[PDB]
């Protein structure tokens, strides 16, 4: 019910990644051309995101999962930045 009077930008912890994440996608299976349903828990699994059918798919468009890289990754910006924040 509160009206937004401020916005706040902050970094995210992978733990925080999970803090919202609705599971993880692990094999990139959009859909079979026969079966046009989200094939697996893949990049569009209904459960990870939400019911495709009417709460309708809005929750899908809002609920988000994560993907865990075995090898950690680096935010390209923080180095590619003209001042490479990490390198500085």
């Amino acid at each position: 019910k509160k009206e937004v009077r401020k916005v706040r930008i902050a970094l995210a912890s992978p733990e925080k990644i999970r803090s919202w994440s609705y599971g993880e996608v692990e094999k990139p299976e959009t859909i079979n051309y026969r079966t046009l349903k989200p094939e697996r828990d893949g990049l569009f699994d209904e459960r990870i995101f939400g019911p495709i059918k009417d709460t309708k798919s809005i929750v899908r468009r809002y609920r988000m999962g994560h993907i865990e890289l075995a090898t950690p990754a680096a935010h390209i910006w923080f180095v590619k930045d003209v001042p490479s924040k990490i390198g500085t």
Binding site: V4, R5, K6, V7, I9, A12, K16, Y22, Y62
Partner: protein, 1096 residues
């Protein structure tokens, strides 16, 4: 209607044909029109010789000598008419004869290959690309030569430069840094020029003898005597100066690159570089550019002159050696044929690449025909230039005059290198050289103002984009009727006398006469002019010269009027101006609207679509007559039948006047009696008030032609059948769709009426009548899978074309303007019952708001008002040269004549003056407008000679205080372009990716809302209205439909949510490493996604 021409100037020569520019360019581009042995080699043969000779001499086995002998293309594969009916392109297949030789004995010669199906130029000049024809445009640029400018930073010292084109190729730059530097840059890097001179064959001793003979900086080249003692070694040292990681041992490796073909420009030898060379610096041009490779040594008859030039201009004054950048004389023009030939050469070069690879891959010599030849590359390249090149576009099919003007106008911009959009301020101002060269009033106003203009009407290109203009030779006190088309540069060499000067024949009539010495007014004796202005006409382009009384009008709106002259739509009724310039005959002559009888003869038959003539030669030929032909914009196209059967017509006799010709005369728009007076509010600023009669009479109307089209496809979901079926509800509207899929012809159409039936996946998916207006069905085309010569695109199961016609009468919102510049839009047509009427029942057609003229600077319009008013009673026309034409003395003469006519017949009616006339005349005396004591007859006559007279109201019938000038004004209806039509959509479609409403073919479409509009809303406290706009009327499908339903039941609309694009951007932020938290009044997260984000 006798023609009273007032201007008395002996035009020694007539106007030349207009559009040859586009013909010859193409015509001269293709010498194939004559025997390939004909000397014309520009275009085709030049590209052959440049790129045909593909040699692999020593690479494995070489000796590949594929030599061109003879080319030709002489067939349009299908007729232009068919090339429209089917969207086929009018072309000719060009065969290039070629013979292959090798180091081995044996000469395989594959003669003919249809390499190039090059579109053939239409008689007009346009080319049929796909069903329709386009037109190419020419441009301006820097003439390729040698030019000189003081050093931008170093003002004391200047610099010289040589400009070879194409761009790829070194740009010669020469400057002297007296500290010991002789700086020449080819592309980027400086190089001491003297080393190159020695490379060329020049010794320091002679270089100084004949160079330092007069100048001082010659010692700046003797200094490098270290490289001055090794001439040919100097070349290897040159390539050492090159640092490409390459071995300096190359006798002329890069020297050829700096020779004649590739980097040095191939500009015509003699003027293209020589004239710049012969004239400015240097004498002879042995080879267009600097080239010598026959003996390993080099010859360059330019760089020695260039350096002699630098010496001269730096030290002495052997001439006036300073080249102007913006002077037209050194600024050249480009033709279409050049583009044909350069894309042609690009295609040949690419083909040389492939044939080169294939010959070496080609094991045996039995490879000339196919293994060496494949037309795919250059053929597609020509297609790309004539279709994928932006230069050529739609042709101006507004009126024949519009077309001719468009076809004889040149711009500055083009590929961009010549000149791009952001720098024209200096170019936009009319150079002095434009005199007799460029009409500075024809340029398109706007961003591209000073960018485009029609050349001087009488001025023409002599050889190479260089305008020469007629000028009356004037010898001493004797002028010569001989006219010399002078070069702009040559123009400065003399004193050009004006044409307005009176003469007694070949001898002037004034000792003190102005002349154009070098673009200045020089008031000198008659003996000081070498040439005198042939005519004011030569001063302007064609479109300039068609407004009679230019002598009393401002250029600001003179350009406006000349431009609006192009947008005239040919009318149902074609009228010629009451006062003309004199070219309408020549206009309809050069502009092929009307038909003209070749020679003397008689009419065999004149049918509504044909005319068989029988000439005095004993022959007879028939010519089909264009009844109704659509334009680029959907207008009528007819040659008005002007000759009866068995009618003796002479040579060049107009046969059927074009769509906008009265009697072999320019006739568009109409002449209407008009009175200028500030009426209530319907002549507000430039609003025009019209009486009803011009609608009662068939006096302003045209047919507009609409060309719809649809197709059936074979969707993988199921081919989209073009059918009559609307599955769900109603068959009643299907009666109109008479045949299955296709509709019946010759019917009116209402908005939303089915046009082409069809169903997708079955799901009903068919064509309908577009919203707005449709007229009557006229034609259809049905190219199903049965493609006779058509290639329906993939997926396209079939195609269909539909033609409707709507006889558009002039209506309330229409817009009109006069030749003299003043424009406006019809404000209201008033019932002629009460509208003001003359003492004679005859009332005027249009009443204007006078306040317009004073701000405007245009008196020629009122002068024409008087002239047309006179011609009214005189029932006769006039010819007024722009400045030499009528004079106000003759104006008052005709005024007295016409008033005498009118009121002598008034008297014969048994009626002189009315009490209203007497009172108004008394009041004019009160204002002094009429001399007190003069007869009401005589003072009314003077008022008439004033061009003003009395008027009666009609509603209150009262006479009008203050006499008013009126006349028969030749007013035109401008292009009532599509912006006129309502673009008013409430509900309908939306975008795919976004939910912003977008209709179009189905529904009108949502209007652009812009940003500064929201800024204005911001200025007001428009909070929830703006919220509604951006949410209920901008993006929110759910909210917009919710408001839809609220309105449907008529209740209070719902509450818009948080901007969902906003939430989407929030989710985007969260998607990346960024985390976004909304904050409370105190620092606390506040949730936008109420329960749609928290897990569980």
């Amino acid at each position: 209607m006798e023609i009273k021409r007032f201007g008395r100037i002996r035009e020694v020569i007539p106007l030349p044909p207009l559009t040859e520019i586009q013909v010859e360019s193409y015509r001269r581009a293709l010498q194939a029109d004559v025997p390939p042995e004909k000397r014309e080699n520009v275009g085709i043969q030049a590209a052959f010789r440049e790129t045909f000779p593909i040699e692999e001499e020593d690479k494995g086995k070489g000796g590949l000598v594929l030599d061109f002998l003879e080319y030709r293309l002489g067939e349009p594969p299908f007729p232009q008419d068919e090339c429209r009916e089917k969207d086929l392109t009018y072309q000719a297949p060009l065969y290039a004869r070629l013979q292959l030789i090798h180091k081995d004995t044996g000469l395989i010669k594959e003669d003919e290959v249809f390499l190039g199906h090059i579109p053939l130029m239409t008689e007009d000049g346009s080319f049929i690309i796909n069903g329709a024809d386009r037109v190419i445009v020419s441009q301006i640029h820097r003439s390729p030569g040698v030019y000189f400018t003081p050093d931008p930073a170093r003002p004391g010292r200047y610099i010289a430069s040589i400009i070879p084109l194409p761009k790829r190729g070194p740009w010669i730059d020469l400057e002297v840094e007296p500290n010991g530097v002789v700086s020449m840059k080819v592309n980027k890097r400086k190089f001491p020029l003297v080393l190159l001179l020695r490379v060329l064959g020049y010794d320091q001793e002679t270089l100084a003898r004949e160079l330092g003979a007069y100048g001082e900086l010659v010692q700046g080249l003797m200094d490098e005597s270290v490289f001055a003692m090794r001439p040919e070694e100097a070349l290897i040292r040159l390539f050492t100066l090159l640092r490409p990681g390459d071995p300096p041992k190359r006798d002329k490796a890069v020297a050829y690159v700096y020779g004649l073909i590739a980097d040095p420009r191939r500009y015509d030898l003699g003027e293209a570089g020589r004239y710049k060379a012969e004239e400015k610096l240097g004498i002879r041009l042995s080879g267009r550019t600097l080239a010598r490779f026959e003996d390993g040594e080099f010859k360059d008859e330019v760089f020695l002159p260039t350096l002699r030039y630098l010496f001269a201009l730096t030290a002495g004054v052997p001439g006036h050696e300073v080249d102007d950048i913006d002077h037209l004389g050194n600024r050249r023009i480009r033709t279409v044929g050049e583009l044909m030939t350069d894309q042609f050469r690009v295609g040949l070069a690419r083909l040389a690449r492939g044939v080169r690879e294939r010959m070496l891959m080609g094991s045996e010599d039995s490879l000339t025909p196919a293994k060496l030849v494949n037309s795919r590359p250059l053929e597609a390249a020509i297609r790309e230039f004539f279709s994928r090149s932006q230069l050529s576009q739609f042709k101006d099919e507004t009126n024949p005059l519009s077309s001719l003007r468009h076809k004889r106008r040149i711009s500055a911009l083009g590929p961009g290198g010549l000149t791009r959009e952001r720098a024209g301020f200096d170019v936009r101002d009319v150079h002095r050289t434009h005199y007799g060269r460029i009409c500075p009033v024809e340029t398109p106003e706007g961003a591209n103002i000073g960018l485009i203009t029609s050349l001087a009407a009488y001025a023409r290109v002599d050889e190479l984009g260089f305008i020469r203009t007629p000028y009356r030779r004037v010898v001493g006190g004797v002028v010569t009727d001989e006219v010399v088309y002078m070069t702009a540069t040559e123009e400065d060499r003399y004193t050009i006398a004006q044409a307005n000067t009176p003469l007694e024949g070949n001898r002037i009539a004034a000792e003190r006469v102005v002349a154009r010495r070098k673009g200045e007014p020089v008031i000198v004796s008659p003996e000081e002019v070498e040439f005198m202005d042939v005519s004011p006409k030569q001063v302007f382009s064609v479109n300039t010269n068609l407004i009679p009384f230019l002598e009393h009008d401002d250029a600001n709106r003179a350009l406006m009027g000349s431009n609006m002259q192009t947008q005239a739509v040919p009318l149902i009724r074609a009228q010629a101006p009451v006062v003309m310039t004199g070219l309408e005959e020549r206009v309809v002559r050069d502009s092929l609207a009307a038909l003209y009888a070749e020679e003397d003869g008689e009419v065999a038959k004149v049918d509504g679509n044909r005319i068989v003539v029988r000439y005095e030669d004993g022959r007879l030929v028939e010519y089909p007559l264009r009844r109704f032909y659509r334009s680029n914009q959907g207008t009528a196209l007819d040659q008005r039948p002007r000759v009866v059967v068995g009618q003796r017509v002479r040579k060049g006799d107009l046969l059927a006047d074009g769509p906008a010709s009265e009697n072999g005369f320019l006739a568009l728009g109409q002449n209407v009696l008009v009175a200028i007076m500030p009426f209530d509010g319907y002549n507000f600023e430039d609003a025009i008030v019209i009486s009803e009669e011009l609608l009662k009479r068939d006096f302003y109307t045209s047919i507009h032609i609409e060309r719809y089209e649809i197709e059936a496809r074979d969707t993988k979901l199921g081919p989209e059948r073009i059918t009559r079926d609307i599955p769900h509800l109603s068959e009643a509207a299907l009666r109109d769709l008479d045949e299955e899929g296709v509709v019946r012809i010759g019917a009116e159409v209402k908005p939303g009426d089915i046009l082409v039936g069809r169903t997708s996946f079955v799901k009903d998916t068919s064509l309908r009548v577009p919203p707005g207006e449709g007229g009557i069905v006229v034609r259809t085309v049905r190219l199903r899978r049965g493609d006779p010569g058509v290639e329906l695109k993939p997926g396209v199961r079939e195609v269909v074309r539909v033609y409707v016609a709507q006889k558009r009468k002039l209506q309330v919102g229409d817009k009109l303007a006069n030749r003299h510049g003043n424009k406006g839009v019809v404000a209201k047509i008033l019932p002629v019952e009460d509208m003001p009427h003359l003492p004679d029942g005859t009332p005027v057609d249009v009443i204007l708001n006078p306040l317009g003229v004073p701000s405007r600077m245009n008196l020629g319009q009122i002068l024409e008002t008087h002239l047309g008013l006179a011609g009214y009673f005189l029932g006769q026309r006039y010819i007024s040269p722009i400045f030499d034409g009528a004079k106000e003395p003759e104006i008052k003469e005709l005024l007295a004549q016409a008033f005498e006519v009118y009121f002598g017949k008034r008297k014969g009616e048994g009626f002189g003056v009315d009490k209203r006339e007497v009172e108004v005349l008394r009041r004019a005396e009160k204002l002094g407008l009429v001399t007190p004591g003069k007869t009401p007859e005589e003072q009314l006559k003077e008022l008439f000679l004033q061009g003003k007279v009395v008027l009666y109201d009609g509603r209150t019938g009262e006479p009008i205080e203050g006499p008013i000038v009126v006349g028969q004004m030749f007013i035109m209806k401008l292009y009532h372009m599509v912006e006129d039509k309502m673009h008013a959509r409430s509900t309908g479609p939306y975008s795919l990716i976004t939910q912003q409403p977008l209709g179009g073919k189905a529904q009108f479409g949502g209007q652009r809302f812009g940003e500064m509009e929201v800024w204005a809303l911001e200025a007001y406290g428009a909070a929830h209205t703006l919220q509604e706009m951006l949410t209920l009327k901008s993006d929110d499908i759910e909210g917009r439909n919710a408001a839809y339903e609220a309105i449907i039941k008529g209740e209070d609309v719902p509450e818009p949510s948080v901007p969902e694009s906003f939430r989407v951007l929030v989710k985007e932020l969260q998607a990346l490493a960024l985390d976004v938290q909304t904050l409370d009044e105190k620092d606390n997260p506040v949730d936008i996604f109420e329960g749609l984000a928290s897990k569980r």
